[PDB]
Amino acid sequence: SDRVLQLKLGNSAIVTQEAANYCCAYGEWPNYLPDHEAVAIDKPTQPETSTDRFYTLRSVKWESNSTGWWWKLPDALNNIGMFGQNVQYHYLYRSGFLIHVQCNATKFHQGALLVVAIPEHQRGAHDTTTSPGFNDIMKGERGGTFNHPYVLDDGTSIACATIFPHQWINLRTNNSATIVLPWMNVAPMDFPLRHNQWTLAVIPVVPLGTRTMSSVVPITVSIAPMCCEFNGLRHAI
Amino acid sequence: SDRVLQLKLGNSAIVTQEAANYCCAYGEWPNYLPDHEAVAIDKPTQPETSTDRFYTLRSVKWESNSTGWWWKLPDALNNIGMFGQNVQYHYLYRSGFLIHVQCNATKFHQGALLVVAIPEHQRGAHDTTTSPGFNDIMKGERGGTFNHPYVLDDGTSIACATIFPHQWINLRTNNSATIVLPWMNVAPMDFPLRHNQWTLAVIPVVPLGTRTMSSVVPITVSIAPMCCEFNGLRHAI
Amino acid sequence: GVPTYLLPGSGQFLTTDDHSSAPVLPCFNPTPEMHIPGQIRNMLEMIQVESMMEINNTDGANGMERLRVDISVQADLDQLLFNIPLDIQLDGPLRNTLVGNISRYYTHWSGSLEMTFMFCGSFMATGKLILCYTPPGGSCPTTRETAMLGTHIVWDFGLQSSITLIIPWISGSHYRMFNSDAKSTNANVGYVTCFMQTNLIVPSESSDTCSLIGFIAAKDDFSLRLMRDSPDIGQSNHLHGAEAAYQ
Amino acid sequence: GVPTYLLPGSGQFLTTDDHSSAPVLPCFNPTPEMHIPGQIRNMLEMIQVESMMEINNTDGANGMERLRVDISVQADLDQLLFNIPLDIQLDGPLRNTLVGNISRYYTHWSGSLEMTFMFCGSFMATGKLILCYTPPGGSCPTTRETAMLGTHIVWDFGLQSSITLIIPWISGSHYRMFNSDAKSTNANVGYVTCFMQTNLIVPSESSDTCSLIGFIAAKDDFSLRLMRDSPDIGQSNHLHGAEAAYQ
Amino acid sequence: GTHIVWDFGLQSSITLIIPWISGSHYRMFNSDAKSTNANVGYVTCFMQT
Amino acid sequence: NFYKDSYAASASKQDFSQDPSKFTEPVVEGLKAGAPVL
Amino acid sequence: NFYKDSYAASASKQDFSQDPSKFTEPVVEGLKAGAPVL
Amino acid sequence: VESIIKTATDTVKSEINAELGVVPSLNAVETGATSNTEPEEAIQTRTVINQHGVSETLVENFLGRAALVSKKSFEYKNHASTHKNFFKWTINTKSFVQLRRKLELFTYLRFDAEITILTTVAVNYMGLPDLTLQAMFVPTGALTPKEQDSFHWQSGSNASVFFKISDPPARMTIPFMCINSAYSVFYDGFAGFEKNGLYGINPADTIGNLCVRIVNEHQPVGFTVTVRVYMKPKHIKAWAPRPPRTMPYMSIANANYKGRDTAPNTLNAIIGNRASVTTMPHNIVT
Amino acid sequence: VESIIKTATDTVKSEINAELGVVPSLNAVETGATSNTEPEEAIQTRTVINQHGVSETLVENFLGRAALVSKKSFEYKNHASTHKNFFKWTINTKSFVQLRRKLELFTYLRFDAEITILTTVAVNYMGLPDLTLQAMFVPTGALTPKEQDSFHWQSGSNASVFFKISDPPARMTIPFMCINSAYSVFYDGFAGFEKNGLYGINPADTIGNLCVRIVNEHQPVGFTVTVRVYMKPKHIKAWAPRPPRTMPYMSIANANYKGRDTAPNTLNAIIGNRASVTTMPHNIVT
Ligand SMILES: CC(=O)N[C@@H]1[C@@H](O)[C@H](O[C@@H]2O[C@H](CO[C@]3(C(=O)O)C[C@H](O)[C@@H](NC(C)=O)[C@H]([C@H](O)[C@H](O)CO)O3)[C@H](O)[C@H](O)[C@H]2O)[C@@H](CO)O[C@H]1O
Ligand SMILES: CC(=O)N[C@@H]1[C@@H](O)[C@H](O[C@@H]2O[C@H](CO[C@]3(C(=O)O)C[C@H](O)[C@@H](NC(C)=O)[C@H]([C@H](O)[C@H](O)CO)O3)[C@H](O)[C@H](O)[C@H]2O)[C@@H](CO)O[C@H]1O
């Protein structure tokens, strides 16, 4: 009942028969920008189905010594489908996100992944005073990996990361995590190519293990923008 | 409809068939001094038609290298007709002004004149610490010319001169500019021979040009005092 | 008496404080007020008046030549005529304008701007131009096919001599600010470019080079915040005569 | 005028004082408020979220290995698996948690704590554990027969993956406090121990060593008092770039 | 394109709906598989995990 | 203001009246939106 | 507050509103006491 | 036309337009009126309830700031063998450019003036004396003291303020005292009935003389004393805004100009140059 | 869900439980929700009317403290032949770790800032001079003074506060001045349209520049003057709490980390080590 779930947006749908309810970040739900909070005065374009749909990124392999993975939003999708086109042709964008992380294995496998959506995850560099560079941060669709997940690559800690919207994928329990993200920013809209509102982090707190036949166990991320709005139309960057 | 106009005051009248509406400085209109603002207690003389009429000054020639012209009020009229006589015989005067600048050419000519009425246009001298002299300021009916119109001969700028009551004479559009000026001063009346309330400035921002037959293109100024009042009668200065 | 205690800040002189103070001349009767034309109550009233942009701010252009942009009959199509940098908080064509000068007494701004251009060629001259506003993000467009994708107005020369390009307030944040970095995400406004839509066409006796005068002003949806000293004026020494005021 | 007199305390600057003070920018209009997700109004809201305890804080355990406790199939009965020191005001497994970090910005505390453990072995793995909370007074129990006499929960692994051990507020005084003496009667909370109730049992193809992740949080009957600087952060020199802020 | 992510479990089967998406009211056969009034598009299946 | 002279009072920052048109549209005949100016 | 700008006022320590559930239970379907979570 | 404005105007959503005879984007600069084209008529807009305030630009606030108008340093010592322990300053608001340029954005101004006097001292070390100073307001061209100890300082009618260096800066308000209804920031005329008078200087706009002395007799050693006077206008009414000053100021007595040696703000070019009218400065090079 | 809480919740007495299908102590951490097991369901409780207040943990109080944000010492003397009697400080809240860590417990913060300035002096003995200082607020990247006596200090529009060392610390409130609805304590982005900009630094979150000078001219001898600035946020609104900082700070410009040389707070181990997971530290040895 709270273990099965179907998500349908646009021409895309996803089902899971081993879910664990689902998270609505801070108890909120995505919505379009109201007139009393608007700033940009040009009429926005609201593409709906062409952008508010699931985009599946390339999978990653969960290995015995993996440290974790991360994908920044909207960067990860800024070059995918019609969402990517609207982003490139407009100076301003706004949207929520429906995140679905997938990972199945066997009843003989064990492992636990923390799936957390971090707002404003400003990365820090290790053992140097030089700030992270553009290429250290903007990985796009491929995403990046954690160097020191223990401190969330920012000098804090993964132990307290549960203060952020999250779920876990504990192999003996579930095979997917779902998190709904509302627009999260101090401004009603933003320039999509230089600022990432959210960072999806998937970290194996308990490593993958088993004594049965060894198989490649992938982790897959599907993300659907929600209530997309774009302003400041011009040429593609 | 807003391109044709007839101005009639006293025994004088002027028509234009190529106007551009007309300007009422600061949205005001000339009027006689009310009892609740009066200071001088002697009964004033209000000549009406003998002074509130159009006075046409000598024309000037618009040349390819002209820098601009200016006429200070009431100085420019202090020696013309009955307005001039009342001014010379009275210590105090008060009046508004109806200004009409004229300049026609050909449909093959181009040029744009800024016609602006500047309140308290205190001139500055160029490259010296010595203040302008009496003869640099009081030109009378002949008026003067701009040395550096770019900075309105006062260290500011013609670019922002549009903050003052004005119109333009853009040859392809109109052949005249009309500006109605109300009494402008911090006192209800003033001594006409030592202080000029307004300065009419006509500056060619876009020089006169054509490839057709070359002809002398004049610029003419006609000014009609309005609601004239004089106090402090004595002998002529 | 009343028991009291002084708080931090006591005795200080804050130039922006607001208190009453001892009248120097008791029983003084100020001169009665008189109606005077042109009263202004909010500086926003002043910046709504359009003033001339110094678009031709180039070496070789002197004085008023800098206040007009000359366009000529072209031999090629879709020609780029000129562009205009848009930070009303930095030096450029927009700095010495009513909106630019007053805005520079502040640090934050918000609102739509309007650029009006008046064609000053002869009556027999015709033409169509396209004025484009490109929101920030990339490099300034250099071709009409690219500029045309942004906000724009196609202008046809005729009896009505002037066209207005509205630069609508399009910003992520409520306000934009000055911080001396023209490329900052909270400062860059984008670009304005002008191309021939068709071409300037004139007969033999009309000048074949004509001028445009561009004006700019704020609309009434404008707002300015955080007063600061203007960078447009300064002094190194005493002005002439200043010391004589003591003699 | 009004006769007055200054009281002791006049002119002082108390960092915790609460008074109004001169506005630097008169007539400044702050940016309109906008709804933003996740507003927090009381720090007690934050400590109610459970976070990971660093139970395996031992030499040889690096990084995340310290955040999980491994249990193996035992050969003997009633085996002790691990214990956890309970002073959320001292360094130990509970210090770097949401409740621990925030509580350490205070000196007094009161309320129930909750420890939740999630079993992360394979689905085919089964087992029963007993988690015990022993109120203060003696030495930490080392046998199940002794620990079992205190507050406890017997946990059976199954579909519901996690168990919660409530550490009820059991104190003589309204609040407990930190004073750097872990054995003080007003500080010591007691102990938490975990023993096999039966045993961890798994088939040949399941890993025979499984991990538990322990979390802790405060319940809503919690209260913190007497703010103080946190001992979890400090500096000896200027941070890099600090002095450059003056250049 | 249009899709469904299928998770194996107790419910053994998944359904992919191929919605009627055509410019014309009907499609037709004319022995030319690449004709604009015949080609329906494609169905592909990949591993999600 | 505890002083007897009103001019000694603190500032008066409450005059929100405006009339931009005296500077922006000082034309005798009002210009209608959309209609040709001339 | 004797200052004309409201932001100059003393602190506002009277907002006792709370909603821990936005952090503690951000699940779409509420969890009932005693009932199996899954 | 007049109305109460407390926030920037809202924006109303607009639709597509294709109407013959309606051309809101066309205007006629020649009329002297500023374009009335609204955003809603130039592009398709959305609805926006704008809450941005407009109070920081109120004239009262714009000019309502205590700005430095006078700074005078002199030697406090035995002047047996120059400002001998006192000075006289003909009040004017044209010596310091920041205040001057702002006031000159207007033609006429009516306001009361809050005066604040700040004093600092330095030994020419055995400590700094807490001296008492006297600032006496002496009307236009009126009789000023000629010695630190003349009888004139008895100030029988002139207003005098005595203050200590250890006290907060002295402060008092000079009312709007012009003989006219407003001060003339600019004056296109001559202040006298003859032709040799000074141009642009209306005596009616000179608040007066400020005579400041150290009351204490000189000490055995000399000190440098600096007096700074600040002025803040309030209860302000302003008329006829003007083009802002661009060329550097040259004198306090006139608007004479010369311009900087090179742009910006040179007589020949106010704005700095760019390579050409198609050269975009600060172009984004991504 | 939202409600007014003024005291810790009461406890209700509970009885024995033996109900099939009811397992309050079991939970599912995977859902992301924190355990909802109540004490009453875990053990048998008594009734307790809890009167413990919760006001000291209100965000307004937690962050409502004047914390040191700037400390600058410079030499006040004749600098004929370094901060020459004045300095400029780009305001930031990242230099002192105690305030920084607390602010960083949140993602976004909206607040007004009460600024208090404390000044102390020491002779480089004949007594301590009661100097007058000037602190001028100069906006972001705006024009700052380059000399103790430049014209810039005339502060025509910038706000300036003049205070004496003998007076109580100067104080004033800077309003919430962000161009956004709240300050970004953390910023996962680049402040410019090009790719070479600084990461994690949103200019919109820099309150501005603080320019402080000694107004007095130099004395015959030199002094060391130290200026301390304190900031206290008020009228606070906070959003999205975050994991507390564990690794020592390295720079004010980023979150770079290295960790202590040995636990506690080393990159490899945040908590200090104990012999084993069955070793009870501070075990009571009765
Ligand atoms: C400081 C910075 O971020 N960049 C500097 C460049 O801007 C500078 O290049 C010159 O910049 C000039 C800026 O124009 C103003 C201004 O500050 O906005 C215009 C002011 O009206 C003017 N004020 C006065 C009283 O004249 C002001 C002033 O001249 C300068 O501050 C004095 O240097 O300049 C302008 O655009 C010039 O045309 C341009 O070359 C370069 C020069 O090397 O240095 C950068 O650090
Ligand atoms: C002071 C006292 O009563 N007992 C001392 C022992 O506690 C100490 O043994 C070490 O104690 C360490 C305590 O952990 C903290 C703390 O003070 O709570 C954790 C803080 O986060 C940390 N702060 C920072 C910025 O790193 C802090 C700090 O490192 C120390 O104060 C610096 O010394 O420590 C911890 O548990 C160690 O693992 C433990 O060995 C002994 C050491 O000889 O001295 C006793 O006096």
A195 CA → ligand 1 middle, Å: 30
**What value does the CA radius of gyration of chain G take, rounded to a whole number of Å?**
20
Query: Do the beta carbons of residue B181 and residue B98 sit within 8 Å?
Result: yes
Give the closest residue to D212 by CA, choosing from C170, A112, A192.
A112
Question: Which tokens belong to I142?
Answer: 């705006």
Give the CA distances from residue D34 to residues A219, B192, H245, in Å, rounded to whole numbers and listed in that order.
37, 60, 40
Query: Do the beta carbons of residue I143 and residue I217 sit within 8 Å?
Result: no
Ligand 1 lined by C180 (C-beta under 6 Å): yes
Provide CB contacts within 8 A for G32, sequence distance 6+: none
Q: How many CB atoms lie within 10 A of CB C94?
A: 28
Does C23 sit behind a cis peptide bond, omega within 30 degrees of 0 on the bond before it? no
3-state DSSP of B8-20: EECCEEEEECCCC
**What value does the CA radius of gyration of chain B take, rounded to a whole number of Å?**
18
Question: In chain D, how many domains are there?
Answer: 1
Q: What are phi and psi of A8, to 5 degrees?
A: -135, 120
* Residue bearing the CA closest to ligand 1, atom 18: C91
Provide CB contacts within 8 A for C172, sequence distance 6+: A39, A40, A92, A187, A188, A189, A190, A191, C185
CA D12 to chain F, closest CA, distance in angstroms equals 28
A159 CA → ligand 2 middle, Å: 20
**What value does the CA radius of gyration of chain E take, rounded to a whole number of Å?**
15
Query: Do the beta carbons of residue B227 and residue B86 sit within 8 Å?
Result: no
Q: List the CATH number of the domain containing B10.
A: 2.60.120.20
- From chain C, pick out residues whose CB is under 8 angstroms from the CB of A237: 137-138
Query: What is the number of alpha carbons within 13 Å of residue E40 lying toward its C-beta?
Result: 10
Query: Do the beta carbons of residue H227 and residue H119 sit within 8 Å?
Result: yes
DSSP secondary structure code for residue I58 in this structure: B
Report the alpha-carbon distance of residue B122 to residue B134 in Å, rounded: 12
Give the closest residue to A41 by CA, choosing from G16, G29, H49, B37.
H49
- Judged by phi (left if over 0) then psi (alpha if -120 to 50, else beta), residue C38 lies in left
- From chain D, pick out residues whose CB is under 8 angstroms from the CB of H61: 26-27
Test site for ligand 2: of D66, D91, D235, most ligand atoms within 8 A of the Cβ:
D91
Give the closest residue to B98 by CA, choosing from B19, B24, B17, B186.
B24
Give the CA distances from residue F19 to residues B140, C44, C102, H29, H234, in Å, rounded to whole numbers and listed in that order.
36, 10, 18, 20, 21
- From chain H, pick out residues whose CB is under 8 angstroms from the CB of D25: 56
Task: Look up tokens 């000048």; give the residue.
Answer: C207
DSSP H or E stretch at residue I191: none
The size of chain D, in residues, is 247
Type of residue found at I177: M
**What value does the CA radius of gyration of chain I take, rounded to a whole number of Å?**
26
Q: List the CATH number of the domain containing H175.
A: 2.60.120.20
The size of chain F, in residues, is 38
Question: Which tokens belong to C56?
Answer: 């031709």
Query: What is the number of alpha carbons within 13 Å of residue C4 lying toward its C-beta?
Result: 9
User: H56 and D27 in contact by Cβ < 8 A?
Assistant: yes
Report the alpha-carbon distance of residue I114 to residue G7 in Å, rounded: 10
Which residues of D line the annotated binding site for N-acetylneuraminate? 91, 95, 231-233
User: A110 and D125 in contact by Cβ < 8 A?
Assistant: yes
Which residues of I line the annotated binding site? 260, 264-265
Burial class (CB in 10 A: 0-12, 13-18, 19+), D62: exposed
Residues 117 through 146 of chain B touching chain H, CB cutoff 8 Å:
119-134, 137
Report the alpha-carbon distance of residue I25 to residue I39 in Å, rounded: 10
Exposure string over D144-176, b if 16+ CB within 10 A, otherwise e: bebbbeebbbebebeebbbbbbbbbbebeeebb
User: C63 and B149 in contact by Cβ < 8 A?
Assistant: yes
> Domain of I137?
1-286
Annotation-wise, does C232 bind a ligand? Answer: yes
Query: Do the beta carbons of residue A21 and residue A180 sit within 8 Å?
Result: no
DSSP secondary structure code for residue H101 in this structure: H
The size of chain I, in residues, is 286
Ligand 2 lined by I263 (C-beta under 6 Å): yes
Does I264 sit behind a cis peptide bond, omega within 30 degrees of 0 on the bond before it? yes
> Domain of C72?
1-247
Q: Which atom of ligand 1 is nearest to the CA of H260?
A: 26
Report the alpha-carbon distance of residue I154 to residue I160 in Å, rounded: 9
Indicate the SS3 state at residue I116. Answer: strand
Vertex C174 angle, CA C169 and C180, to 5°: 85
3-state DSSP of C39-78: EECEHHHHCCCCEECCCCCECCCCHHHHHCEEEECCCCCC
Give the closest residue to C112 by CA, choosing from C46, C22, C176.
C176
Alpha helices in I90-202 (DSSP H): 97-103
Q: Which atom of ligand 2 is nearest to the CA of D92?
A: 36
Terminal alpha carbon distance of chain G: 55
Give the CA distances from residue A169 to residues A5, A178, A219, C16, D205, in Å, rounded to whole numbers and listed in that order.
15, 10, 10, 58, 21
Question: Which tokens belong to C130?
Answer: 């396209």
Type of residue found at H101: R
Query: Do the beta carbons of residue C80 and residue H278 sit within 8 Å?
Result: yes
Type of residue found at D160: Q
DSSP secondary structure code for residue I40 in this structure: H
Report the alpha-carbon distance of residue G37 to residue A1 in Å, rounded: 10
Burial class (CB in 10 A: 0-12, 13-18, 19+), H57: buried
User: H98 and I154 in contact by Cβ < 8 A?
Assistant: yes
Experimental method: X-ray
Query: Do the beta carbons of residue B78 and residue B97 sit within 8 Å?
Result: no
Question: In chain B, how many domains are there?
Answer: 1
CA D228 to chain C, closest CA, distance in angstroms equals 23
Which residues of H line the annotated binding site for N-acetylneuraminate? 260, 264-265
**What value does the CA radius of gyration of chain D take, rounded to a whole number of Å?**
24
Cβ-Cβ contacts under 8 Å between C and D: the total is 52
Instruction: Quickly list DSSP for C110-151.
Output: ES-EEEEEEE-S-TT-B-EEEEEEE-SSSPPP-SHHHHTTSE
Vertex B46 angle, CA B41 and B51, to 5°: 140
Q: List the CATH number of the domain containing D68.
A: 2.60.120.20
Ligand 2 lined by D181 (C-beta under 6 Å): no
- Judged by phi (left if over 0) then psi (alpha if -120 to 50, else beta), residue I180 lies in beta
Ligand 2 lined by I272 (C-beta under 6 Å): yes
- From chain C, pick out residues whose CB is under 8 angstroms from the CB of I142: 107, 178, 180, 228-229, 231
Vertex D172 angle, CA D168 and D176, to 5°: 75
Query: Do the beta carbons of residue F34 and residue H23 sit within 8 Å?
Result: yes
Cβ-Cβ contacts under 8 Å between D and F: the total is 3
Query: Do the beta carbons of residue C215 and residue C50 sit within 8 Å?
Result: yes
DSSP secondary structure code for residue C185 in this structure: T
Ligand 1 lined by C182 (C-beta under 6 Å): no
Terminal alpha carbon distance of chain F: 55
Ligand 2 lined by D91 (C-beta under 6 Å): yes
Question: Which tokens belong to E14?
Answer: 């998944």
Indicate the SS3 state at residue H151. Answer: helix
User: H234 and F26 in contact by Cβ < 8 A?
Assistant: no
Cβ-Cβ contacts under 8 Å between G and I: the total is 81
Chains adjacent to G (≥3 CB pairs closer than 8 angstroms):
A, D, I
Q: What are phi and psi of B27, to 5 degrees?
A: 65, 20
Report the alpha-carbon distance of residue H75 to residue D88 in Å, rounded: 67
Report the alpha-carbon distance of residue C13 to residue H114 in Å, rounded: 12
User: I256 and A131 in contact by Cβ < 8 A?
Assistant: yes
Instruction: Quickly list DSSP for chain B.
Output: --S-EEEEETTEEEEESS----EEGGG----PPPTTT----SPPB--GGGTSS-EEPPPEEE-TT---EEEEETGGGTTSHHHHHHHHHEEEEEEEEEEEEE----TT-EEEEEEEEEET-----BSSSSPPPHHHH--GGG-EE-S-GGGTTTTS-STTGGGSSEEEEETTT-SEEEEEE---SSSSSB-TTTB-SEEEEEEEEEEEE-SS----EEEEEEEEEEEEEEEEE-S--
Provide CB contacts within 8 A for D192, sequence distance 6+: D83, D84, D86, D115, D131, D132, D133, D134, D165, D167
Q: How many CB atoms lie within 10 A of CB B43?
A: 8
Question: Which tokens belong to B87?
Answer: 């001014």
Report the alpha-carbon distance of residue I208 to residue C178 in Å, rounded: 11
DSSP H or E stretch at residue H63: helix H59-63
Burial class (CB in 10 A: 0-12, 13-18, 19+), E39: exposed
Bridge partners, residue B113, by sequence:
B169, B204
Query: Do the beta carbons of residue B178 and residue B7 sit within 8 Å?
Result: yes
Annotation-wise, does C78 bind a ligand? Answer: no
Indicate the SS3 state at residue A176. Answer: strand
Provide CB contacts within 8 A for B223, sequence distance 6+: B54, B55, B57, B71, B73, B76, B77, B97, B98, B99, B100, B200
User: C56 and H277 in contact by Cβ < 8 A?
Assistant: yes
Report the alpha-carbon distance of residue I239 to residue I250 in Å, rounded: 25
Indicate the SS3 state at residue H55. Answer: helix
C113 CA → ligand 1 middle, Å: 24
Query: Do the beta carbons of residue D134 and residue I280 sit within 8 Å?
Result: no
Query: Do the beta carbons of residue C168 and residue A124 sit within 8 Å?
Result: no
Contact of B164 with chain H, judged by CB distance below 8 Å, is answered with yes
Vertex H263 angle, CA H262 and H268, to 5°: 90
Report the alpha-carbon distance of residue B123 to residue C216 in Å, rounded: 27
Q: What are phi and psi of C60, to 5 degrees?
A: 105, -20
Bridge partners, residue H180, by sequence:
none
Give the closest residue to D67 by CA, choosing from H173, I95, G20, A158.
A158
Resolution in A for the shown PDB structure?
2.2
Give the closest residue to A201 by CA, choosing from A132, A119, A108.
A119
Chains adjacent to E (≥3 CB pairs closer than 8 angstroms):
A
Question: Which tokens belong to H134?
Answer: 């006297």
Strand A12-16, strand E3-5: pairing: parallel
Ligand 2 lined by D150 (C-beta under 6 Å): no
Question: In chain H, how many domains are there?
Answer: 1
**What value does the CA radius of gyration of chain A take, rounded to a whole number of Å?**
18
Query: Do the beta carbons of residue B192 and residue B66 sit within 8 Å?
Result: no
D90 CA → ligand 2 middle, Å: 9
Type of residue found at B131: S
* Residue bearing the CA closest to ligand 2, atom 9: I272
Report the alpha-carbon distance of residue I258 to residue I250 in Å, rounded: 8
Task: Look up tokens 């700052």; give the residue.
Answer: I144
User: A38 and H49 in contact by Cβ < 8 A?
Assistant: yes
Query: Do the beta carbons of residue H180 and residue B187 sit within 8 Å?
Result: yes
Query: Do the beta carbons of residue I77 and residue I222 sit within 8 Å?
Result: yes
The size of chain G, in residues, is 38
Give the closest residue to C168 by CA, choosing from C94, C104, C105, C115.
C115
Type of residue found at A99: I
Strand C108-110, strand C176-177: pairing: antiparallel
Give the closest residue to I145 by CA, choosing from I155, I156, I153.
I153
Report the alpha-carbon distance of residue H284 to residue A136 in Å, rounded: 22
Query: Do the beta carbons of residue B228 and residue B49 sit within 8 Å?
Result: no
Indicate the SS3 state at residue H262. Answer: coil
Q: How many CB atoms lie within 10 A of CB D228?
A: 10
Question: Which of F5, F11, F37 is nearest residue C23 as measured by Cβ atoms?
Answer: F5
Report the alpha-carbon distance of residue E3 to residue E15 in Å, rounded: 10
I228 CA → ligand 2 middle, Å: 30
B162 CA → ligand 1 middle, Å: 26
Bridge partners, residue B223, by sequence:
B55, B99
Question: Which of G19, G23, G38 is nearest residue A2 as measured by Cβ atoms?
Answer: G38
Instruction: Quickly list DSSP for D110-121.
Output: ES-EEEEEEE-S
Which residue, among B1, B2, B3, would best test binding to F if mutated, counting the most F CBs under 10 Å from its CB? B2
DSSP secondary structure code for residue A75 in this structure: G
Does A74 sit behind a cis peptide bond, omega within 30 degrees of 0 on the bond before it? yes
Terminal alpha carbon distance of chain E: 18
The size of chain A, in residues, is 237
* Residue bearing the CA closest to ligand 2, atom 21: D232
Residue of D nearest to F3 (CA): D1
I208 CA → ligand 1 middle, Å: 20
Report the alpha-carbon distance of residue I201 to residue D175 in Å, rounded: 42
Instruction: Quickly list DSSP for chain D.
Output: ---EEEPTTTT---TT------BSSTT--PPPP---S-EE-BHHHHTTS-EE-----BTT--GGGGG-EEEE--SSSS-EEEEEE--TTSSSTTTTSHHHHHHTT-SEEES-EEEEEEE-S-TT-B-EEEEEEE-SSSPPP-SHHHHTTSEEEEEE-SSS-EEEEEE----SSS-EE--S-TT-TTT---EEEEEESS--B--TTS-SEEEEEEEEEE-TT-EEES----TT---SSPPBTTGGGG-
I244 CA → ligand 2 middle, Å: 18
Report the alpha-carbon distance of residue D72 to residue D127 in Å, rounded: 11
Query: Do the beta carbons of residue B136 and residue B123 sit within 8 Å?
Result: yes
Q: Which ligand is nearest to the CA of H271?
A: 1
Burial class (CB in 10 A: 0-12, 13-18, 19+), I94: buried
* Residue bearing the CA closest to ligand 2, atom 18: D91
Query: What is the number of alpha carbons within 13 Å of residue B231 lying toward its C-beta?
Result: 16
Residue of A nearest to G29 (CA): A21
Report the alpha-carbon distance of residue C200 to residue C192 in Å, rounded: 20
Report the alpha-carbon distance of residue D93 to residue I274 in Å, rounded: 10
DSSP secondary structure code for residue I103 in this structure: H
